[model samples]
Target: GICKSSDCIKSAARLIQNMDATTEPCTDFFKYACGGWLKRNVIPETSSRYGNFDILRDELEVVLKDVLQEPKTEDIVAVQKAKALYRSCINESAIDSRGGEPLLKLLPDIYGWPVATENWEQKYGASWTAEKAIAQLNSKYGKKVLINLFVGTDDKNSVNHVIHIDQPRLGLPSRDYYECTGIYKEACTAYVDFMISVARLIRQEERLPIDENQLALEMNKVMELEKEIANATAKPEDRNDPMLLYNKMTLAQIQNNFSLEINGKPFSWLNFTNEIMSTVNISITNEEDVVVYAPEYLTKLKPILTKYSARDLQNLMSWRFIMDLVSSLSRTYKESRNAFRKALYGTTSETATWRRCANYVNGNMENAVGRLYVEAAFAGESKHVVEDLIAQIREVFIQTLDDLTWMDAETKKRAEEKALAIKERIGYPDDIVSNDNKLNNEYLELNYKEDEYFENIIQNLKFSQSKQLKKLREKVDKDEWISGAAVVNAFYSSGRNQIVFPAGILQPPFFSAQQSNSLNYGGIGMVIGHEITHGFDDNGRNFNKDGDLVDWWTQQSASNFKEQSQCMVYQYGNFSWDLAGGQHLNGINTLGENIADNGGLGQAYRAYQNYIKKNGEEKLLPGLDLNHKQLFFLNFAQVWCGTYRPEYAVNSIKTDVHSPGNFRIIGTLQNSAEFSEAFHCRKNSYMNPEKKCRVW
Candidate 1:
């Protein structure tokens, strides 16, 4: 072992520090892989979870903060504007001085709230309807309540954009939390308490006469109505099947089939859609073709709507609008929200103000902030380095298809064709950082004042919404990254048949040019492979090479695929999460991600083997006493090392698609023969289960 570079030595040190090697790998590999790091670290008070990714994400936040806090040396308007937004967000004095006056004016003016106004009938009477409320929310603030209306890629005809109507998410995490008991009951109770507190704050500001008991009654009615809406929502397991969800109907058909009326005067889907579209001045009639995601959800929603009064629906929708913008308000609003946050996530405090501001700025004007990050923080050489790794891993992925016995030739050939045809978007886009004109044009409409923090955020929301709405008239750009490059995440867009890894995720622990070949392949290499394999996952399998939702698999192979997936469904479903108040994982809901995890790990392992064959065996870390083969698997487990708060765990078990990190490692490794082989596990041991589920 001649590798004694500082980078190599540091990598070695981290492995030893983050590992508890005394534990048997076969008995419990997740603990063996991450027990050292787990004991060495504690969950931060400001966050509900902590891990290697969270640590790295916080580190990224530090640098982005520095860049934003720097002097305005650049001439670009977007970069300068991004700095202004950050300055506005971090201005605590400006925020505190205004207090909640912004929201005081906001609630009464547009589709008025019953809680905020003492005399509801005087100003906002029968003239304002739910149709008007959603229009204002969508057009003015980009908020979607009761119904979600927007422009998106048509699932079937992938080439063009279409208007999509779907079931909207509830105030809580999912449907189960709304209807469940025990700890879930605590969240619901805290939520109603939160609703009352925010309304009290509003009434307090306007000097409106207080009726505490009456307000409690009002808020509780909102809850009952929300519960009804939640009941109408599709279960997460049922929604996992995208094929079952997609229903296309013309605007004329939608209006005739479903109705939500006020005093026998029915709600018109045509008028409601046109009202939101009116913001961009594009009105449509019966000729409009719309994609409905949940027809049954809508059907169930109507009967419940018929039961509730206009006051109840108005209060619920206004609560949704007010709840969304509360974080953008002053300190009192955030403090009021703390009780709800505590019950929902177990965190007693918030992250630092500067870090919060940096994220808020970046999240709003993503590409503009991405431009700053590329200029100030991103590595120039990272693009080509990741590009080469993806090619190598993709080739290995294609080769592994022939090894599977569950499917036959024609489907396998189509699978290989799609795998080979996959496109990669690595690091940041070129025009964002290099071309000044291009970057400036992206945020040309967004103008942020240093003092008007609340108003500036409202403007950013409006700009963000209008940009999406306007996309309906324009032809789809196939190569656009889904979000900004300064993000710490990767994505696989089913419609585009492409994978994206932003500049923010291309760093140490995940990727480093100086790290050992094993570590590099195990880290970002697995991430690359994960995204590519998503192309063939349960939902992604429906899409063709052109990214159209077309089934290319033979009927026998399709049936075989279902049988293979069902094994994993029950395998994960049986895992009882003690941390989350004894709830079991919803395996059906999490099936696609589990398939990706299983396939991605296998593909990454095989690719690492290919790298060793082509480039010769790599040097081992000193004092770790592990071979490169074993190191690859160790680093893989370490990447997923993390801990979650009990409250967060409960909510996430019902909501998050991917299982928790412990389960991710436990589940993926149990199916991996290579991992069991590398660690020398006995046959039929915990790590080397006799039965394994492989969808890929």
Candidate 2:
């Protein structure tokens, strides 16, 4: 009944509908498999890009909307809270009525804005230092201006949580925006315009004695400061090496090493660090060592601070505060931001209001929404099916390890053990959905006011910061998930040594009971293998079977891996994306993902072959000339069908770790000899290259 004649006919029709018969499979499999779909669909104005991922995410949001819209009668406390949060987000009248009032009232207490106030010295006392401002922002609202401070498991020691400090993120997409020439120069101009607009808006609304000329001067100073900071930040390629970034230092050493004399007075870094830790109930002795991710950037901070006046620093911090909460304020602020989005990513129009509100609710209260999503959309039987699929993929990965000629026996044995140790988390966390009490306890302290949306947002941020601070002294929960179940994405956590498949990704095209084994294997099967292969990727190879950050590779195997990986780096680097104004792929930047893509395709195909060996050849569906093997590759390519705007493509190439959709499909298949065999490609053709690169 599962594989009836009608089911086979429908799937066969769907494959034919997505294909372009004019294009040959060998020359351009991506165009052959996706050309029809691309021709039929246009990128939506609201989105910068559209593809299978976006489609599935939109579908999941509709399901969440239904669950949230339902009446809260005799439901659990967590469910009630989730509904309340959603209701507050959609209450546009309340948001519009209070236009910019919430943020304006709170600005004076945090740090008085010199640009807005005539008598700034009297309003904000001399005691209100930049150190105090940074500590208050970081502790209460998780706003990182000059530096990012958080608690996470140390890279060298994966068990105990420790404080980690890193460079601050720029307002633009990448550091290239601030440093590079061409289109990015134009974006910087637009950024300056945005800064001026925010200042003008505040002056008009608050009726303050703020001069536009003075505000412009202060804003320019802030931009110059950020540019210098960006210059000191590490390049994208250099940051990829985890070992080089991990530098541990004592609290006293950090204080002494990174200090500045501002306004002819010594600003004690030791006092600032202590004040921040004290706010979160974390008492660190002078001897306590903390991980400093970018030591050079930290050292550069001293001179940057010394070059600027106290008012200059205050202007920068005030601008950052506004940028953080501008989107939640009013329509004028949102439109100003949308204009920036248009210049940056080439979006034609702003996203729909309902969609934006829904996103806010989902992001802020994911666990609560996730609990309802699992109950309404996810089936218990799906978890068992995925678990069995994971086991099959794991076995195939181990078998492939034995077939690698470059690896020694001892290294291969350790690789196999790590593969076996790789844990799988499917669908949703059991306790979050099953036990109401456990879910209720998560949000028991969180109270929401439906009328005050901005305050609600601030409350959520403070709550989130508290939870993260609590983890500094707590044990690492290995079973905890980084992403919620309702999110339509999969992840591989090297620190946890685990693979995750959320419930939202386990639907039609990716995974379904009605689809044939060939389709499922090519869809979700490849996803499983992709995540598993990450355990052995360039960055992941540093971590061992127990999820500890220890080297477990032989010298010969490690060298061979680098040699094999170089071939891929060269291969992908040569292919240029036309959408990104002919930007070539950065092989070094995307090495980990490329490795995972190639290995995932290989292992999934091998697992499919193993299935064929036991069950014989799969039955051919009607109305299609291709065999099951060809169908497998077709479905795999179909899963990656999509397009992107040129601006978005450029941004992704610079910042995103994953390769573009077109390259992901084409690059993997080119290295797969089985793909060439299935399609009957000529020797040394584009798809069937003579020298293939392989690493597992």
Candidate 3:
């Protein structure tokens, strides 16, 4: 009865229906069944997971405010008053007016909108045309500032470079225009038309003093010269007789004027630094030469060029340029996010405001919101319930180690020691929550002024860099958080030998005290096991029990481990990319994550079985009448629910190390005989791949 009319089927059906698909072993069902379970169990308004849906609603509220305020702007006094009033609503719940108001109004306008209160998607639809969206998408000023800030050679933001966008997709609905094939094609055409119109507008606007077209021509010419120089050299290690060309390119970048021409014009410094520097390394004479060559040269050039252009080309060469680039690129995404925000709030200005919003949101959005949601889920109760749940799941992790046959006694003993030593950080840190000044001071230091945004971002970056570097000489603080307290994520850092369960990811569809042990273990317990397994994953295992990069395994064991890891690489690599067999999961790139997924599921399930033995299997839920074991697997499936836009999905596939959520569920499950037994799958079911590969 449990299998025939189960919560798994109902939740799986809900996920399938949500995606509007009818395929067998529905892709949506695989990725998001657990997500649907959480969605039904938790209130969307309180959380940020599938609660990204709530963001849609919150944004609509902001759009309503904006629409209503537009009519009041006819009177100058009313407009000022409206601006001030709107600004007043800027504080989280409108606490401080003057200090928070300008920031509030500036945020949504600059960032586009918020996504906590409105229903903008209904109003706009897939083909929704909005002036605000157009302005942000193809704005010359915005694009130029972003490109100048981030893309140039001198001031590259390491943070920005670490992030990747627009890479190929990895999972089902792999390509854009596949799911929304018809509507997506039209949207593409519309986007092109919109860009073309914006370009025409820039051409028409004679107000800006700079010659954008002429600059473009000069930039292109420099790019061609750089290409010629790049191909002229064969190897990076080669010592060419005439290093003059490379030297000239470097000098031109440092000096901000290179006479070398490809199309009978002076080459741009940006082109030389980016295009030419790749293959040709102009020998640095000494540390002094570096100080005088680029970093220092740009430092010197920043002040002189302040008069020629506020854009500051030399600053582009400096390290600070990286900060600007990251900030600008983030802003572009922030602006694009307006539609999501508009769908959530009646007035996007209700929150801390967009344009001048702090960067803390980048790492903390889900965490902050998730904390409140979790508290609400427990009905304002103590975290005793959640802590108990974590303790239970952690035991499952230990049991998994005991069960592993491949591990030698010594390795197993060391693993158990490390397991006992694993420190769990729940919810927010003690510093921020316990010390009011700690959180307040950090927020106060963040400069979010509109006009000084770019400059302030640079200052913030410098401060962040200094703060991080300060810790370099000191012993690494293992207790210190690797990410923000409010982030909605979890990770196990091998370098630190610690597993981080962020406050954001600690809620349903992952964890809920109200949920039965089966659901809790399957949902959040799986993730917990995943992080713990990372401690023994290919990359993670390299670190010894002390968390140092020391080998602890025997030669035979090491060889066995490599062979097993290679099997996973080969197994996943066979998974077709773009539905073609040739392209597979990148062996080297995806090994650690694939290993984590396999080990995580095994450990979590083993832990679940231990819990069930200790405490009797929990009762089945309503509608979905499934046994505790079945429920465990269902809960795991549910957490990965919800459909991504095709383009986003495809981009994730190629670029993301973690396989698509669908593959994460199916790929992982198909490998487990336990899953097959629990679900009672046919021998040849897609969920029951014939040959299962095991690494742990």
- The best candidate by TM-score is 1
Tens digit of lDDT per residue, candidate 3, span 608-690?
Answer: 77777877666555554346776677667656653333333334444466764556677788788998787677777777868
Task: Show where candidate 2 strays beyond 4 Å.
Answer: 1-6, 262-267
TM-score of 1: 0.98
Choose the strongest candidate by lDDT.
1
The local distance difference test score of each candidate is 0.85, 0.82, 0.44
lDDT of 1 by residue, 1-696 (tens): 657889989888888888898899998888898999999888988888889888888988888898888757645787788888899999898888888999887776566778768767667766777787777887778888888888999888777889998888789988888874887888999899889999999889888988999889999999998898899888877777677778888988888776677424478887889888888888888879999988888888777888776677788888988887787788899888897888888899989999999999888878878877877888889889999999988998888889989999999999999988898999888888678887788778778889999889888778888888887768789768876888888889899999999998898777898899899888888888889988988899989998888889999998998999998898888888888868899898788888888888888888888888888998778878889989888888898788999999988998889888888888888988888888889988988998988877
Q: How accurate is candidate 1 locally (lDDT)?
A: 0.85
Worst 10 residues of 1 by lDDT: 256-265
Candidate 3 — worst ten consecutive residues by lDDT sum? Answer: 162-171
lDDT score of residue 48 within candidate 1 = 88
Question: Residue 315 lDDT in model 1?
Answer: 86
Tens digit per residue, CA lDDT, model 2, 1-696 = 233477777777778887787899999999999898899899998777888788888888888888887766787888787777777878878888888888888787677667766677667747777678777777778877777777888778777788888988887788888864776766787787788888878778888765778878878888888888788788877776676777888978888887766643566665666667786677778787789988888887778778877777777777777787887878887766766777678797877666676677778777788888898999889999999999999999998887899989998999998999998899988888778888899899998887888888889888988788788778888778878888998999888899999998887687887778888889899989999999998888878887777778889898998998898899889889998888799988888999998998888888888889998877777767788899889999988889998778878888888988889888898898999999999988788888887886
Per-prediction TM-score to the true structure, in the order listed: 0.98, 0.97, 0.58
